[PDB]
Amino acid sequence: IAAALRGALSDRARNGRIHAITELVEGQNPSTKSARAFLASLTERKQVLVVIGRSD
Amino acid sequence: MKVHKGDTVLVISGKDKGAKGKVLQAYPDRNRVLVEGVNRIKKHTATQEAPIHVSNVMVVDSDGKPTRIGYRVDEETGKRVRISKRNGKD
RNA sequence: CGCGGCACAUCCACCUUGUGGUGGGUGUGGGUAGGGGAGCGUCCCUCAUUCAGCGAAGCCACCGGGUGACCGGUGGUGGA
RNA sequence: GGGAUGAGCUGUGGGUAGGGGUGAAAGGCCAAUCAAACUCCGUGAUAGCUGGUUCUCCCCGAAAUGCAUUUAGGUGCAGC
RNA sequence: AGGAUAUGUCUCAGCGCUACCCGGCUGAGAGGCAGUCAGAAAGUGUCGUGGUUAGCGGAAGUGGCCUGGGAUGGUCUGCCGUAGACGGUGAGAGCCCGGUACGCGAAAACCCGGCACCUGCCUAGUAUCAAUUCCCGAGUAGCAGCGGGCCCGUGGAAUCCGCUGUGAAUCCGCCGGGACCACCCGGUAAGCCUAAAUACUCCUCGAUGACCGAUAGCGGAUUAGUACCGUGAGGGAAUGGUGAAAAGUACCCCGGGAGGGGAGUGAAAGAGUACCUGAAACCGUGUGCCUACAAUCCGUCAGAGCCUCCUUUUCCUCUCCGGAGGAGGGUGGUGAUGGCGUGCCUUUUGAAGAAUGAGCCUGCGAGUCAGGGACAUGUCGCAAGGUUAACCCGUGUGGGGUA
RNA sequence: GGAGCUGUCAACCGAGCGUGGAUCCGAGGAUUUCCGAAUGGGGAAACCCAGCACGAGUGAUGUCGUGCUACCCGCAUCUGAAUAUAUAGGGUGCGGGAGGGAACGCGGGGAAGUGAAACAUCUCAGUACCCGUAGGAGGAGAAAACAAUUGUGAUUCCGCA
Ligand SMILES: [Mg+2]
Ligand SMILES: [Mg+2]
Ligand SMILES: [Mg+2]
Ligand SMILES: [Mg+2]
Ligand SMILES: [Mg+2]
Ligand SMILES: [Mg+2]
Ligand SMILES: [Mg+2]
Ligand SMILES: [Mg+2]
Ligand SMILES: [Mg+2]
Ligand SMILES: [Mg+2]
Ligand SMILES: [Mg+2]
Ligand SMILES: [Mg+2]
Ligand SMILES: [Mg+2]
Ligand SMILES: [Mg+2]
Ligand SMILES: [Mg+2]
Ligand SMILES: [Mg+2]
Ligand SMILES: [Mg+2]
Ligand SMILES: [Mg+2]
Ligand SMILES: [Mg+2]
Ligand SMILES: [Mg+2]
Ligand SMILES: [Mg+2]
Ligand SMILES: [Mg+2]
Ligand SMILES: [Mg+2]
Ligand SMILES: [Mg+2]
Ligand SMILES: [Mg+2]
Ligand SMILES: [Mg+2]
Ligand SMILES: [Mg+2]
Ligand SMILES: [Mg+2]
Ligand SMILES: [Mg+2]
Ligand SMILES: [Mg+2]
Ligand SMILES: [Mg+2]
Ligand SMILES: [Mg+2]
Ligand SMILES: [Mg+2]
Ligand SMILES: [Mg+2]
Ligand SMILES: [Mg+2]
Ligand SMILES: [Mg+2]
Ligand SMILES: [Mg+2]
Ligand SMILES: [Mg+2]
Ligand SMILES: [Mg+2]
Ligand SMILES: [Mg+2]
Ligand SMILES: [Mg+2]
Ligand SMILES: [Mg+2]
Ligand SMILES: [Mg+2]
Ligand SMILES: [Mg+2]
Ligand SMILES: [Mg+2]
Ligand SMILES: [Mg+2]
Ligand SMILES: [Mg+2]
Ligand SMILES: [Mg+2]
Ligand SMILES: [Mg+2]
Ligand SMILES: [Mg+2]
Ligand SMILES: [Mg+2]
Ligand SMILES: [Mg+2]
Ligand SMILES: [Mg+2]
Ligand SMILES: [Mg+2]
Ligand SMILES: [Mg+2]
Ligand SMILES: [Mg+2]
Ligand SMILES: [Mg+2]
């Protein structure tokens, strides 16, 4: 299981699909409009996996 | 429903798209209304209207354009009231 | 036996020179019980992509196609 | 055709219940079923027995013998 | 337990015969602690950012053009999103509707928690010595007979349970450690109570499904445990779909009606309450060819002749014609005539068999699943190592977990 | 809660109600025929016939309404037969039980088909079924326990062994 996950992430990184951000919305309240604008800035593809901490 | 018997409405979908009439009777269980002069019907003797879906009409705000219905917390005296959006007052 | 098509096994030479293909010889290819190998069609799910009220599915007819289960094209009927 | 004042026939009400009843005795009858009723359950009983078992092609391809068997129309091992 | 060294939650009153020491008991008050509990039981209040039983609000397109009966479709544009769950609306709708994210909401009743009231318990025995005496659950244990149950089917048969008989001991006791004995070790039977971790779903809410979709799924989408069958216990069915809207065909004609024709509604009546689509068996009507001198597992190969529709020629050249016809060729239908030819399945040494099964069509109807099972193989990971089980933490399929 | 409504098959009507808040939803209360454990007595369940007390009605019988009246067990009281002590029994007054429910628990009774290629020991299986009796769970539970020269320390359930 771990080897497969590592291989998949390695493929993503090798093709350059790993992005790193500080946080999604500079405020303390949610805002889908600005979050979507930021994601569209990062990416123009359909399926995006957002990995964020459980406390955000 | 938010559409009442005495109201004036605008048809937004169907054959009579763009017609203005007043509700004649409402069927809350069926979600249908009788608007005057819409989707007339040729019945047989021995041309009335047939009800249309309340989803297909929008309440004219009595101040011009049609609007979606909201509720302003009256009461203040002594119950709730039904108002407009888009220049809300009713 | 002649001429043409197919398949299995093997030999001889190349391309990854047995993962498998390419070229030529040679041998083989009746089959019940039964063993082994490779496929067709139906339905559901996931991923990608592509058609559909300018007409999907289903059904009917005709014209074609493949070594087999079977497939396609056109038209009609139909209505998701 | 037999009996037809009798060991008669019959109505109404009641009793005996399944290895139990009842039987002037035939294994008769006990709801069109009786050498052990019927219903549900055990239960999808079990059957060395009969029947059935659904698409395709390619390669190979038997046995009906020996031994043993509460065995001989079954099975185990060998042979193929 | 009872005896010798040692002393009083605090006070008051009463009693323990009288004056005293030492006390002890009861009652009251003062304190401390506990509480609806296994360890004692009820009830009255009052208060919850507590819960359950109704609910409410809740962002954003009347957008242009095309097709269309209808836009939720196509294509241009605008927007919301803590809401792009789901469903409805005249066809695939986040912005039309019910809703969804989110956030509010309880007279009263019930439940849970708190604080009080209330209720109860605690009124010196601690420590040391003595080691004489008493107590430590009786028709019990033990033993024997016959059984049951334990891995243990009576066996060398321990431990546990029943009936019958016999029948103790109180710690220098008694029971167990797989016959039994000695030593050692462990424990203290014959009195009671005790949460949690575990099992289940008639039922009530909320979700979900590589579950079914009307011969399926519950027997039951339809009057369903109904109709019907049986004296009875019992057994036990079949029956869904017009259309977006009923706009369900006014009026005329034939007819006793039923039914139909014309009009009319509808996008459609090639949707007419016998109604979505509408297969097959089966039943007609019309039409092309063949068939009344022939012996036929009903086909197959050879094959003339007719009929039909396309095409290369010589002609009606009227020809811009179009094709009448002729000659050839080709589709398709039919098949005069000639040869060959013993249905399918099962089961058999051997079946066309006069052995079995099948009237026909449509639907349904048979090697599946479970388990760190066993053996053998293909493939992938790690490798002298490989791997976790239960379980714990996570919205998941993820991370831990060495027994 | 806020404008329509008088449930459905299932329409046709008739007649009405509703912002002075209807229909609808929630909670509490009232009423609640007869049968059924059925319980005054009887009975072919849904029927029949009473007694007592209190009211209603009649000129008076007739008639009506509302309560109570089963049996067993426990407790408290009065009485104490044959018969003397007394007891059995009897009267009174208070409490309780009975019946139902899909599964799950505990205690007791307990098959056969089947497998053993026959069959009786054995298996199936302490299963099916039956009886008693629960609770939201139950049962078990605080060593007259294991272990073995070290030690663990009530019970239950899960995984190994
Ligand atoms: Mg062959
Ligand atoms: Mg074969
Ligand atoms: Mg159309
Ligand atoms: Mg399909
Ligand atoms: Mg087609
Ligand atoms: Mg089609
Ligand atoms: Mg009788
Ligand atoms: Mg005889
Ligand atoms: Mg008979
Ligand atoms: Mg019998
Ligand atoms: Mg018998
Ligand atoms: Mg069985
Ligand atoms: Mg061969
Ligand atoms: Mg609302
Ligand atoms: Mg148009
Ligand atoms: Mg839609
Ligand atoms: Mg949707
Ligand atoms: Mg709508
Ligand atoms: Mg025994
Ligand atoms: Mg023994
Ligand atoms: Mg004894
Ligand atoms: Mg020993
Ligand atoms: Mg003791
Ligand atoms: Mg106990
Ligand atoms: Mg417990
Ligand atoms: Mg059915
Ligand atoms: Mg169907
Ligand atoms: Mg009957
Ligand atoms: Mg028309
Ligand atoms: Mg149509
Ligand atoms: Mg149609
Ligand atoms: Mg029909
Ligand atoms: Mg039809
Ligand atoms: Mg002739
Ligand atoms: Mg002949
Ligand atoms: Mg012939
Ligand atoms: Mg011949
Ligand atoms: Mg024979
Ligand atoms: Mg035959
Ligand atoms: Mg024959
Ligand atoms: Mg024969
Ligand atoms: Mg025969
Ligand atoms: Mg035979
Ligand atoms: Mg036959
Ligand atoms: Mg599988
Ligand atoms: Mg392996
Ligand atoms: Mg009410
Ligand atoms: Mg009520
Ligand atoms: Mg009675
Ligand atoms: Mg009685
Ligand atoms: Mg006396
Ligand atoms: Mg009871
Ligand atoms: Mg037996
Ligand atoms: Mg046997
Ligand atoms: Mg047998
Ligand atoms: Mg209870
Ligand atoms: Mg208990």
- Protein CA B61 to sugar C1' E338 (Å): 96
Going from the C-alpha of B77 to that of each of B24, B73, B82, the distances in angstroms are 29, 10, 13
Domain extent for B67: 1-90
Give the distance, in angstroms, between residue B8 CA and nucleotide E18 C1'. Answer: 115
**What SS3 state is found at A48?**
coil
Backbone angles phi, psi at B33, to 5 degrees: -135, 155
Phi, psi (deg, nearest 5) at residue A41: -60, -45
**Cα-to-centroid distance, B36 and ligand 16 (Å):** 27
State the virtual CA torsion across B49, B55, B57, B58 in degrees, nearest 10.
160
Q: Give residue B31 CA to ligand 40 midpoint distance, Å.
A: 73
Candidates A26, A45, A43; CA nearest to A34 is A26
Per the CB < 8 A criterion, the answer to whether B57 and B3 are in contact is yes
Interatomic distance B78 CA / E108 C1' (Å): 22
Instruction: Tell me the structure's resolution in angstroms, rounded to a single decimal.
Output: 2.7
Please list, residue by residue across A14-50, b when 16 or more beta carbons sit within 10 angstroms of its beta carbon and e when fewer do: eeeeeeeeeebeeeeeeeeeeeeebeeeeeeeeeeee
Count: domains in chain B = 1
